[PDB]
Amino acid sequence: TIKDVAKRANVSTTTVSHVINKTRFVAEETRNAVWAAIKELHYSPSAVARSLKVNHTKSIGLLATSSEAAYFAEIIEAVEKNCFQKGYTLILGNAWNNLEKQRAYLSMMAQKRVDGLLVMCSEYPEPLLAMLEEYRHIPMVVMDWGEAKADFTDAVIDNAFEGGYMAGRYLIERGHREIGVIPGPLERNTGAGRLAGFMKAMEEAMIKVPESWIVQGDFEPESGYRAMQQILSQPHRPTAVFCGGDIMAMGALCAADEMGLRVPQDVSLIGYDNVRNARYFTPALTTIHQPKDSLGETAFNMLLDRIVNKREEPQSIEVHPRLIERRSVADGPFRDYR
Amino acid sequence: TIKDVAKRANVSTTTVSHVINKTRFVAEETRNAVWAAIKELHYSPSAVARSLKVNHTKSIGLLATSSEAAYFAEIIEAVEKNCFQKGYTLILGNAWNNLEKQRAYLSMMAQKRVDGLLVMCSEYPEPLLAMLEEYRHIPMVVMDWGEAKADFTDAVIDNAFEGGYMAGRYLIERGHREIGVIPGPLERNTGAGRLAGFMKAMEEAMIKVPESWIVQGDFEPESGYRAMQQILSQPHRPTAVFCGGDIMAMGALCAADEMGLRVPQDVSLIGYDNVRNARYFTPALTTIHQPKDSLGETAFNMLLDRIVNKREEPQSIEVHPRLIERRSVADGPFRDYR
DNA sequence: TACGCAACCGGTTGCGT
DNA sequence: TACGCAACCGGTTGCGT
Numbered sequence: 001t002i003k004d005v006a007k008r009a010n011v012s013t014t015t016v017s018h019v020i021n022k023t024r025f026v027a028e029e030t031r032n033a034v035w036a037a038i039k040e041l042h043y044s045p046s047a048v049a050r051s052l053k054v055n056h057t058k059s060i061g062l063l064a065t066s067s068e069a070a071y072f073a074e075i076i077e078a079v080e081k082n083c084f085q086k087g088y089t090l091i092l093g094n095a096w097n098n099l100e101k102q103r104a105y106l107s108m109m110a111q112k113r114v115d116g117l118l119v120m121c122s123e124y125p126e127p128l129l130a131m132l133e134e135y136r137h138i139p140m141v142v143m144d145w146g147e148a149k150a151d152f153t154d155a156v157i158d159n160a161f162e163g164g165y166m167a168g169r170y171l172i173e174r175g176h177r178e179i180g181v182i183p184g185p186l187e188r189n190t191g192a193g194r195l196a197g198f199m200k201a202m203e204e205a206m207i208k209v210p211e212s213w214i215v216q217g218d219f220e221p222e223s224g225y226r227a228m229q230q231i232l233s234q235p236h237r238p239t240a241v242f243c244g245g246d247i248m249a250m251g252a253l254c255a256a257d258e259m260g261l262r263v264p265q266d267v268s269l270i271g272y273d274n275v276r277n278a279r280y281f282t283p284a285l286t287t288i289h290q291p292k293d294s295l296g297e298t299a300f301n302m303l304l305d306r307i308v309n310k311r312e313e314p315q316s317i318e319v320h321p322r323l324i325e326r327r328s329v330a331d332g333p334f335r336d337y338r
Numbered sequence: 339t340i341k342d343v344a345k346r347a348n349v350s351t352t353t354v355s356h357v358i359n360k361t362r363f364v365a366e367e368t369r370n371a372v373w374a375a376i377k378e379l380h381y382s383p384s385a386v387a388r389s390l391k392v393n394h395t396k397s398i399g400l401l402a403t404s405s406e407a408a409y410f411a412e413i414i415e416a417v418e419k420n421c422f423q424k425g426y427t428l429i430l431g432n433a434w435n436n437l438e439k440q441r442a443y444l445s446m447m448a449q450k451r452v453d454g455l456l457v458m459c460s461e462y463p464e465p466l467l468a469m470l471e472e473y474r475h476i477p478m479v480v481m482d483w484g485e486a487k488a489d490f491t492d493a494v495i496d497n498a499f500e501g502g503y504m505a506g507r508y509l510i511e512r513g514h515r516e517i518g519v520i521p522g523p524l525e526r527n528t529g530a531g532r533l534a535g536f537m538k539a540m541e542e543a544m545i546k547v548p549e550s551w552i553v554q555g556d557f558e559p560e561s562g563y564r565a566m567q568q569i570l571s572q573p574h575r576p577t578a579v580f581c582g583g584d585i586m587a588m589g590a591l592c593a594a595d596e597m598g599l600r601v602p603q604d605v606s607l608i609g610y611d612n613v614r615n616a617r618y619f620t621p622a623l624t625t626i627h628q629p630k631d632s633l634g635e636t637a638f639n640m641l642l643d644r645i646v647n648k649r650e651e652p653q654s655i656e657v658h659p660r661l662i663e664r665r666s667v668a669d670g671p672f673r674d675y676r
Numbered sequence: 677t678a679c680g681c682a683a684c685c686g687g688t689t690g691c692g693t
Numbered sequence: 694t695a696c697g698c699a700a701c702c703g704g705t706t707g708c709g710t
């Protein structure tokens with residue numbers, strides 16, 4: 001069809017091309033005509049054709065886990081913003097922590113020849129670890145590890161441990177010593193990592209956590225509900241609870257409110273993430289905030305660099321968590337004796 | 339590089355091709371060799387090359403509004419599931435109710451030659467209306483109108499009005515007559531349409547809504563907060579409130595809980611959407627459920643048809659809302675006198 | 677000066693033998 | 694029998710004049 005343009009315009013296609021991409025001088029008269037031709041013709045230049053030659057699709061691929069979850073959703077929205085802002089196009093792909101689906105997506109992505117890859121697969125078993133290496137060639141950044149797990153990629157690191165520690169302390173310095181914890185999957189960073197940041201704080205203060213007091217979540221509200229309830233269901237119950245993430249948290253508030261417990265009056269809750277609506281949680285949630293947006297843009301940019309500046313050596317940027325004080329935590333028994 | 343394969347395998351590329359796409363018989367010996375060549379070679383066949391010839395990218399484009407919002411997010415997750423399941427690849431693009439960004443996305447999409455388009459732009463002014471026609475050629479379904487607004491597209495319709503009516507009735511039949519309403523943007527379907535479904539129910543019951551009692555929302559929690567609060571801030575206040583959507587609702591619960599009002603004891607709230615976590619709202623939200631998942635898959639399929647079965651005539655499928663009874667509504671003053 | 681020739685990017689496919 | 698020739702899909706670009 002570029003041919004149809006050149007022809008209506010009575011010029012070559014090389015010409016037609018150059019005008020469309022402002023790539024070498026062209027007479028006005030000339031320029032005009034092509035524009036008109038492109039116009040009456042209702043012309044849209046194919047990018048697949050163009051891509052075939054130039055050797056880049058100008059589109060990036062997000063090999064995500066799931067996309068509804070507030071946490072995820074929020075990052076993604078970020079990343080898209082950035083792609084759009086720099087001409088990139090986004091391919092959102094969710095493997096749902098499934099290898100098979102992951103190999104698949106990875107393969108379609110390669111075939112569609114994505115300029116780069118953004119990886120958020122939550123859990124990284126050896127198998128997934130290996131597959132990814134099989135594509136070192138396509139440039140990529142893993143956005144969700146605690147520390148760099150491989151040399152063939154870029155990594156953006158969150159400091160989940162120092163976030164976990166932050167959560168513990170606050171609890172501590174506010175009067176508590178009988179604390180519970182609902183962590184997320186241990187097979188994750190935001191799971192294991194947040195937990196241990198928290199646990200160090202406890203060891204530091206000679207506070208021990210009764211195992212009947214730590215209940216595994218999966219980052220979903222329901223798991224929050226079930227844990228909160230299994231915790232407050234006990235003879236002896238804590239005065240404060242540290243919840244792995246905001247959504248599961250919001251599920252801990254429900255349960256407590258269902259056994260007519262009071263937050264923060266009967267139980268204080270500290271969450272983790274600082275999702276867009278935690279302030280409108282009830283009560284408004286106190287939690288550790290993860291810079292999700294800088295998490296996103298910071299990832300793009302590392303990619304873009306590898307893409308453009310053709311970098312070869314892996315990089316790793318750290319991002320920082322921070323405390324957001326709301327109204328779901330209350331002083332505890334030991335406040336004044338400090 | 340297909341050439342490099344053919345060569346290592348000592349056969350033609352036509353051959354190499356046919357084996358890779360099981361498109362005509364090939365000797366085993368032959369088949370094997372190519373597989374081996376593809377292998378040692380670590381071969382990934384380009385789809386852009388392939389697309390160039392076959393004339394289809396095998397990828398669809400979502401011209402969305404925003405993607406963090408639970409409602410949206412949930413649909414999207416749906417749609418992706420379906421694309422993946424039928425080989426399609428997804429391009430998520432959010433125009434944020436901005437024409438300029440919309441023209442842009444639309445254009446990149448055309449250029450990248452998407453097999454079809456899924457449209458969710460919330461508001462459709464004449465301008466946006468026109469641009470879309472400029473692409474009748476690319477096959478598309480609008481997933482968010484109340485009734486079909488143009489002949490050059492497919493439409494999936496939700497029945498927002500009969501959802502709005504449902505919400506009113508329940509309120510009514512539960513004892514209420516002093517009701518308020520926080521609608522979403524009137525420039526939308528889920529805004530205007532839900533409102534009027536609701537208002538008919540009221541007219542039907544000689545119930546009038548004091549204008550100081552209807553407060554505009556924007557589907558965001560904060561707008562929920564501000565409205566709830568502007569409503570209960572009055573001398574004379576309603577006994578029940580109908581909220582345009584679940585997230586704004588969850589923001590209405592916060593405020594009420596902040597002026598120490600009681601839900602549903604001091605105010606009953608009926609929401610709209612049935613988002614994944616409304617059950618874990620506090621109290622667990624009573625609301626009208628929109629089949630979001632069937633909303634998604636039902637859209638794909640209309641597209642896929644137009645794509646595959648090359649249909650030309652616009653279609654329109656209707657989907658149905660339904661009541662989900664939770665614990666945020668309580669009997670009202672007139673219950674027994676009915 | 678301002679522009680055109682023609683080869684190539686990596687696959688697919690209609691005819692052949 | 695099982696397979697190869699070569700033209701084409703729609704652009705881009707190094708040399709020319």
Ligand code: HPA
Nearest residue numbers: 069071122188190219245
């Ligand atoms: O691994 C995770 N999954 C879901 N939500 C999360 N929020 C923090 N970490 C996670």
Ligand code: HPA
Nearest residue numbers: 407409460526528557583
């Ligand atoms: O237009 C809308 N926008 C956001 N959320 C929504 N939920 C229902 N309708 C809408």
